[PDB]
Amino acid sequence: SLALSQIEIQQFLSEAHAEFQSEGFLLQGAVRTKSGTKGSIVHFPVFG
Amino acid sequence: SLALSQIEIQQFLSEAHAEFQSEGFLLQGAVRTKSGTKGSIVHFPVFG
């Protein structure tokens, strides 16, 4: 019977799509970097 | 000596009485139950 269209189902996919966005870390290593630092402030001495 | 009644002990039971109430699930078996469903809406197909 064509009445089967009354009990048609819908499928929801488990693979989600994240909206196109930047993943970041684009400027990693572009500047003088100090890793594993401790303390509230890191001081860079400068001479004229 | 009858003075032993001055150090009589009292026992507190560990099996607690629950004030008279329904245990629930009375209507299970009176309706058509379907376990392990998913989603916000569940559809029951019907045939003529």
Side-chain angles (χ1 to χ4, degrees):
Chain A
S1 174
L2 265 72
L4 288 177
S5 62
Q6 301 302 110
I7 50 161
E8 281 170 344
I9 75 171
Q10 285 152 266
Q11 178 166 78
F12 303 78
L13 297 182
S14 40
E15 178 186 343
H17 165 77
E19 282 173 346
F20 293 118
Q21 60 195 267
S22 173
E23 321 219 331
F25 296 120
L26 293 149
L27 305 188
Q28 207 158 234
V31 299
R32 172 181 177 190
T33 305
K34 201 74 193 29
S35 275
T37 67
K38 332 287 268 194
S40 58
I41 304 172
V42 177
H43 303 255
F44 294 77
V46 170
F47 279 80
Chain B
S1 147
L2 295 208
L4 282 173
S5 60
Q6 295 298 282
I7 47 159
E8 261 163 353
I9 77 168
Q10 296 158 37
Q11 200 205 44
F12 301 79
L13 293 179
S14 60
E15 188 170 85
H17 167 80
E19 310 220 295
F20 293 114
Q21 59 196 272
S22 180
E23 284 190 343
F25 302 115
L26 291 194
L27 294 187
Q28 282 211 298
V31 303
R32 186 190 152 190
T33 318
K34 268 282 319 156
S35 306
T37 60
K38 304 288 209 255
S40 56
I41 296 154
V42 175
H43 299 252
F44 291 77
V46 171
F47 274 75

